[PDB]
Design an enzyme around this catalytic site. Structure first.
Site, PDB file in Angstrom:
ATOM      1  N   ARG A  57      37.440  17.723 -58.232  1.00 27.93           N
ATOM      2  CA  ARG A  57      37.140  17.751 -56.799  1.00 27.93           C
ATOM      3  C   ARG A  57      35.629  17.630 -56.622  1.00 27.93           C
ATOM      4  NH1 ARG A  57      34.340  22.082 -56.678  1.00 27.93           N
ATOM      5  NH2 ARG A  57      33.645  22.017 -54.477  1.00 27.93           N
ATOM      6  N   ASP A 247      28.912  18.469 -45.493  1.00 23.26           N
ATOM      7  CA  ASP A 247      29.887  17.412 -45.681  1.00 23.26           C
ATOM      8  C   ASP A 247      29.373  16.139 -44.990  1.00 23.26           C
ATOM      9  OD1 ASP A 247      32.056  18.580 -47.504  1.00 23.26           O
ATOM     10  OD2 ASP A 247      31.567  20.159 -46.031  1.00 23.26           O
ATOM     11  N   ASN A 257      30.073  21.158 -42.005  1.00 20.30           N
ATOM     12  CA  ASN A 257      30.171  21.819 -43.316  1.00 20.30           C
ATOM     13  C   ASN A 257      31.380  22.753 -43.238  1.00 20.30           C
ATOM     14  OD1 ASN A 257      29.054  21.970 -46.039  1.00 20.30           O
ATOM     15  ND2 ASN A 257      28.571  24.108 -45.530  1.00 20.30           N
TER      16      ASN A 257
END
Lengths: 356, 356
Positions: A57, A247, A257
């Site tokens: 991830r 993000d 985020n």
């Protein structure tokens, strides 16, 4: 800015994703924090499954994995002609594309290689192979060197003392070192990190499960708290600065985020605690003007009804926004791999883009 | 300002703690939300084990349980002499006192009954028994009627629409109905409760495990969220007011409540959202001047390292403050069983006590 540390001086962890001996190696992020294990994958199908699996991830680590899936294809293909090889390469591109069709770095990485191969499709087949493999290493190494720069830039501007963070923006969320993770690793080496507060970060608990593990693994001094307590530790004078990842940063400096970031921004401000976002240039989306243009993703209500394996709530309606959006005015600065952006963010971000 | 509803119109739930036919009945809060079970206790030691166990929880409910423990003794004693009864009564009292030497209502409940058995020690013996049983019902009933009153006072002052709360201050935190529980039950009946946001309230998760369970049992429109998402639902304009309970309110209005309450206070203010505490006069400690005089209580690291028993973290240091202290300036008002107190709290609180 001089880079004073190598990756190996900053962490004892291997790369999140590595390519060696015709094999893709991934830290198994599904087994953490109970067990630390490096999986070994020898077929493109195994790599694809490991992306879908979330064995790997973190957006750049996923990108590198996919890219190394094509490298693996190149070194492993049984093709006896260029035509066969390119056909196989296209098949392999498609298999890897359709793991997480939304994850952005995945698409960048694959398309970057795809496009290089089409541009060089008339080169000798050994040279196409060489190029693919080289490109996959470039994708991984670029992430690592972006992280190295971010860490040193961030370490200049944060105070010594007690830092607080949120979610996982460490080595596990990248190819190596982290965004936040790089900054706190440099600070730790420098003797300037006395304490790292870690918000557990419900609902997904990447603070507790991932950050607590990797920062502990490297011997950082760390304290794990419930999200509820971040305001308390700020109130009691226990936090000198707060650093979070992003993000997505947009053109005016608003950023998305993990849920809870906005909460921290508002509490930091109440206590006059410096509050920084750290991300590479590629996370700044200059197409969107402001935070209100970032679409809000909601995830399964099971992430809230359960906590780890345990079901902790009755069958009731849930609201599970994955991300929040923090207005730019709460930011002291934005730490990037090309230097720290100061207010006014709109103007200074567009500068940064013209000169890099 | 009339009581418009009875307990049975507001909730479908039985009392958290009840006494009938020589048996103490308590809702098993250990087994929620999966299982609703009423336990039947027939010996004083059964009742003491249930208080030590946290089969029952919430200060006034622990109170009533203790008191009914003496009622159970009274109606269960073989004792022949009057002085044999008082021996096993001081034994019962001491067993009940040694369960939680710290939770306050337990002591008021037990001392209140002990001073009534010293003040009538030269009555018959059928009479002393009747008084103990009767006094225990007083303690329990007095909680419920105080809740009823908070309920109606609170509904007067909160807006119609979407309400957010934290922890469990419902029926299960009391003898019946709750502090917060009573306000939202009265609003739900008036049709002014459109949606109730419940913070799950890590680390102990009494929002998820208890509040979501009881409010859903009563058909209230409820939505459960991670604590991190409170800020965000406030930002999106989904919250018209916030109401929390209080573990202890001091003379200037500062108050201690479950960790995260202070976080809510700060966020409420940023969005201009009315922010109310609700507690009975007995929760107000007029002898402490301000909130720095409230000592900070840490609980077990396992509360953070695990979630409903599932292990989620590696073995790392934890900080687990169980309560925070919210400065009074964050309060719109304090809803009590004898009316709503407005700023300036210090002046108006001591005027509340002057006229009672």
């Amino acid at each position: 800015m001089e880079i004073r540390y190598t990756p190996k001086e900053l962490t004892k962890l291997p790369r999140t994703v590595e390519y060696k001996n015709k094999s893709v190696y991934m830290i198994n992020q599904r087994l953490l924090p109970k067990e630390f294990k490096v999986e070994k994958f020898s077929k493109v199908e195994e790599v694809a499954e490991a992306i879908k699996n979330m064995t790997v991830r973190g957006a750049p680590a996923i990108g590198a994995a996919a890219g190394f899936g094509l490298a693996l294809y190149a070194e492993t293909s049984k093709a006896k002609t260029k035509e066969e090889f390119l056909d196989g390469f296209e098949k392999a591109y498609e298999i890897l594309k359709n793991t997480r069709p939304t994850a952005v770095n995945l698409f960048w990485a694959l398309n970057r290689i795809k496009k290089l191969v089409e541009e060089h499709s008339e080169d000798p087949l050994d040279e196409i192979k060489r190029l693919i493999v080289q490109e996959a290493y470039k994708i991984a190494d670029e992430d690592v060197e972006a992280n190295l720069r971010m860490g040193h830039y961030g370490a200049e501007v944060l105070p010594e003392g007690n830092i607080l963070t949120h979610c996982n923006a460490g080595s596990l969320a990248t190819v190596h070192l982290g965004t936040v993770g790089s900054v706190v690793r440099v600070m730790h080496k420098d003797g300037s990190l006395k304490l790292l507060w870690l918000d557990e970060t419900r609902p997904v608990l990447q603070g507790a499960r991932l950050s607590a593990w990797e920062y502990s693994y490297d011997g950082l001094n760390v304290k794990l708290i419930a999200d509820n307590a971040a305001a308390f530790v700020m109130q009691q004078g226990f936090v000198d600065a707060i650093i979070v990842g992003a993000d997505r940063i947009v053109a005016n400096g608003d950023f998305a985020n993990k849920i809870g970031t906005y909460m921290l921004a508002v509490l930091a401000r109440e206590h006059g605690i410096p509050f920084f976002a750290v991300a590479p240039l590629s996370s700044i989306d200059m197409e969107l003007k402001s935070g209100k243009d970032i679409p809000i993703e909601e995830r399964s209500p099971e992430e809230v009804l359960t906590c780890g394996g345990c079901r902790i709530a009755p069958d009731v309606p849930v609201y599970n926004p994955a991300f929040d959006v923090t207005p730019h005015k709460y930011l002291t600065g934005i730490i990037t791999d090309r230097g720290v952006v100061w207010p006014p963010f709109k103007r200074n971000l567009k500068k940064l883009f013209e000169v890099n």
